A paper describes a structure:
[name] is a response regulator (RR), and as such is composed of an N-terminal receiver (REC) domain and a C-terminal output domain (also known as an effector domain). In contrast to most RRs (which contain a DNA binding domain) [name] is linked to a protein binding domain, and as such represents one of the small groups of RRs (~1% of all RRs). Nevertheless, like most RRs, [name] is phosphorylated on a conserved Asp residue (Asp58) within the N-terminal REC domain.
Similar to several REC domains, our structure of RssBN formed a dimer in the asymmetric unit. However, in contrast to many RRs the RssBN dimer showed an anti-parallel orientation, which is mainly stabilized by β-strand augmentation via the terminal β2-strands. This orientation is different to the biologically active dimer of several RRs including PhoP from [name]. Superposition of RssBN onto the [name]/IraD structure revealed an r.m.s.d. of 1.4 Å. While the core structure of this domain is well preserved (with the exception of small deviations around Asp58), there were clear changes in the conformation of the α5 helix across the structures. This is supported by the observation of limited hydrophobic contacts between this helix and the core domain structure. Significantly, Arg117 is located on the mobile α5 helix of RssBN, which is directly linked to the C-terminal domain that makes direct contact to σs. Based on our mutational analysis of conserved residues located within the N-domain, we propose that phosphorylation of [name] (at Asp58) is sensed by the conserved residue (Lys108) located within the 4-5-5 interface.
Author numbering:
A (entry chain B): 1 to 126
B (entry chain A): 1 to 127
């Protein structure tokens, strides 16, 4: 199959339009249905009414650091799988993400589209 | 001002990746914060918990014709401004969109990005 993610809903939270388009383009290519949010506060609001199969965010977020997004939904009882894609070198931040429950924390810029591919597959078909 | 839509939340419902990306690019360029949905059923679900300043959709939608999206939110009592962008030539479909309450129905493909610009401005800053 060239579209193995058909039937999967992916929430992408990404403030850079180009990276946002690449991620939409890639996941859509694979058959996923995407929701994209430019802003992490807007994503928090969306998650009130909607439950995706996977959420992709950055923990180093300009408007509102995505750790707080993660913390707020995890306090509610949301078990939504989260994959972090981040350039952060800050080990206290990564450790806080891991304690809140993320599938993984992948380095940005993505220097292996091969790896993300099987990381996304590890999340969506465990 | 080169970013006149700062503080405006726009929901874009668009099944074509490239057009989706163009609209994201354009609205983001003008300072709006965007939410994009590939799929109209997912947009119906999102609107349960979220109220944008403007929704952009096509009435001629593959998965689920966007008239039903429009009819379902309008039966709830949502006053969310909607702008339809569509190549539809079907006068009955346009007329149903207009009865449901739509800011306007703009012809696709978009000749002219000047027009969409002030159409979007009429929706987001009326009077």
């Amino acid at each position: 199959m060239t579209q193995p993610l058909v039937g999967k809903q992916i929430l992408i939270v990404e403030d850079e339009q180009v990276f946002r388009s690449l991620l939409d383009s890639w996941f859509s290519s694979l058959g996923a249905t995407t929701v994209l949010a430019a802003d992490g506060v807007d994503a928090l609001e969306l998650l009130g009414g909607f439950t995706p199969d996977l959420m992709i965010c950055d923990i180093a977020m300009p408007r509102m650091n995505g750790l707080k997004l993660l913390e707020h939904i995890r306090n509610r009882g949301d078990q939504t799988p989260v994959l972090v894609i981040s350039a952060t070198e800050n080990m206290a931040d990564i450790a806080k993400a891991l304690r809140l429950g993320v599938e993984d924390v992948l380095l940005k810029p993505v220097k292996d589209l091969n790896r993300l591919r099987e990381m996304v597959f590890a999340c969506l078909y465990p």
